[PDB]
Design a protein around this ligand. Structure first.
Ligand SMILES: O=c1[nH]cnc2c1ncn2C[C@@H](CO)OCCP(=O)(O)O
Ligand SMILES: O=c1[nH]cnc2c1ncn2C[C@@H](CO)OCCP(=O)(O)O
Ligand SMILES: O=c1[nH]cnc2c1ncn2C[C@@H](CO)OCCP(=O)(O)O
Ligand SMILES: O=c1[nH]cnc2c1ncn2C[C@@H](CO)OCCP(=O)(O)O
Ligand SMILES: [Mg+2]
Ligand SMILES: [Mg+2]
Ligand SMILES: [Mg+2]
Ligand SMILES: [Mg+2]
Lengths: 194, 195, 194, 197
């Protein structure tokens, strides 16, 4: 599964159709991925994670700051799956930004976005040193870009065209993290926070 | 409302937490459950802006509208307990045909879908007989169809193509109501569950 | 299960500690059962239901008006369990208020807001069972504490002999637009008295 | 206000009454604070926080690890407030384990903690943060213990005032375990030894 394939000609949604914070009212252009759609895809990704990794103790590794929202919501759906099934597995958590406890564990890396792939392969190479039982990477967004070194994560929320997006903890110079939707910035917004 | 164009491909069923047996029946997911909620949250703010100045009587049109009704009212309630402006609401449920607690009240009619539009016009004419302050209609869906009488609701979630949809309490021959997403039913599906 | 037992000495919670609609600010006295506790209890009920009734086609009967929100929340949890079991059984819904020939030979779940004297439920049971379903089960969110002698198959909370409002339960059709189960104040009682 | 006061007499809730992860079925004893009750209190805290700190740019500071759940849920409710109004304020976030702290200067800083016991962890952190001269600094703590061993600090925002017992769940841990639990619960003796370091 390459994830939800969002087309190159995807226009997004008009801001007036959704609830968005007033302080970003002119800094955004379009709602690109609605927060609810993210939840729906995340609920499905949780089931996939549970089918590949639920056979042994999982350590969910959050990649701060961008991934913390996807991380929290993904773990929620996994916990929901685990208190309503008789098939369940314990989970511990850790956080990192760009550790001997990962050895012999099923390590799940939770990331916000993969672009060139450099961040993750750096992260993976570091993790593999401590010899886990398996390493899987869940990435909310994967871009179609020629700058890609060729890396693909194991779990994908949305596959998107090479366009700069913000929201759902993804930032533009630390701004737009306080935004539930994933959106594209206006010409005003970029200038304002550059 | 959110305009879903005719050439909209939709989403593959495999992309969401949906049982795979709904594959032969149905076709694609057109409106994910989460997309409904986000739109619905907005509609709650719109409703509370236009009809917030007077006691609202929320009128649920069973059966197809009960989920949209439930969700829209949760978002209204969330607004009412987290801001300065709020208004009391009462609720009521109705169903329509086959083949006075509204007097001086702000009546909000909550419908699942508007096709030709004369279901609402007939309903709208029965109300306003008992002289309310205002009647407004919130419909989750509106179809683009050449069979439309020209009626347009005051609150629209999504404007969809002329294809038969199911899910989110919407049905085809009393089927597929428990589906959490709005999807298009296939021709084979239609014949399969045809009465 | 007698459900979550709520003793008569329980004072509930202060209104200033929770989010309350401003038009019921002095109409209420104490929060009795927080909305989230209702959800947490309801989530458990859904699995108890599916453990007993989940072996056959389920027809959920919603008793309007007071039960509609308990019905909707209970159903979402049941629908969630249904699609998670990888064995989705037919689940159809219906509504009654105080031609249901579609109850024959199926598992009928009656969903009600509150049981006191039990006369409401006795009346509804005689009508339904005059259609011969496979089984009749009654899920009631609230049961008050020697009247007649009836016990629901599924109970959310066992509450004292006290008039409560909220979560679609009403006082003269008011307080329905409230998420918490709360206790009405003296000023509120006289305000909405018939 | 000391938040939702939970009496020392509290028996809690039986585990069979709620939905709990089966791998903790014997490791817990009683459900102490239901997850849904936590949410409802957090929704109220969000408006209390916003009503006091919404006047200027807010920097939300999450105290890892146990602060992660409270932090995510609190900011969710905050976001709902900021998009349901005519007036709202921009917010930036950061995560600390106990950015250049000069980013706190001139800002309304919100410290989000999971639990306060002696109060020393928060007192020391407060003293440090105040040196960078923020516009204001407030502390939000989900749980506050009624303990003899308290230095005497009390947060600006408090979810629950719990008795001097050891609880887990909703990001609060016992030797890194029970973070995958939504409810706040009391750990059993069986689970106390099962994951004992
Ligand atoms: O669309 C975006 N929005 C916000 N930030 C973005 C975006 N793309 C890239 N970044 C920068 C960075 C985020 O931490 O991604 C690096 C991923 P890589 O190492 O190239 O594979
Ligand atoms: O696409 C659909 N899905 C499910 N039901 C549908 C659909 N279209 C029609 N109905 C029947 C009914 C729903 O209440 O609509 C009639 C309204 P109208 O008088 O034509 O404006
Ligand atoms: O605590 C309450 N709040 C609001 N209404 C209440 C309450 N108790 C009773 N009712 C009346 C009615 C609600 O539909 O329930 C009757 C049940 P019964 O026939 O006595 O077994
Ligand atoms: O009940 C608990 N469960 C899990 N962990 C706990 C608990 N109490 C304390 N901690 C550890 C730690 C929380 O970060 O306490 C430091 C706060 P203090 O300086 O003592 O006021
Ligand atoms: Mg990243
Ligand atoms: Mg209809
Ligand atoms: Mg009733
Ligand atoms: Mg801490």
């Amino acid at each position: 599964s390459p994830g939800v394939v969002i087309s190159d000609d995807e226009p997004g949604y008009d801001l007036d159709l959704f609830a968005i914070p007033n302080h970003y009212a002119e800094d955004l252009e379009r709602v690109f991925i609605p927060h609810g759609l993210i939840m729906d895809r995340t609920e499905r990704l949780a089931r996939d994670v549970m089918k590949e990794m639920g056979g042994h103790h999982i350590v969910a590794l959050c990649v701060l700051k961008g991934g913390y929202k996807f991380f929290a919501d993904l773990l929620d759906y996994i916990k929901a799956l685990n208190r309503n099934s008789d098939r369940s597995i314990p989970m511990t958590v850790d956080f990192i930004r760009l550790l001997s406890t990962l050895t012999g564990k099923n390590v799940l890396i939770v990331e916000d976005i993969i672009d060139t792939g450099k961040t993750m392969q750096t992260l993976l190479s570091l993790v593999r040193q401590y010899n886990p039982k398996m390493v899987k990477v869940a990435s909310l967004l994967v871009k179609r870009t020629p700058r890609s070194v060729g890396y693909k994560p194991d779990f994908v929320g949305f596959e998107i065209p090479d366009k700069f997006v913000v929201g759902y903890a993804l930032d533009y110079n630390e701004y737009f993290r306080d935004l539930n939707h994933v959106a594209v910035i206006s010409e005003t917004g970029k200038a304002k926070y550059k």
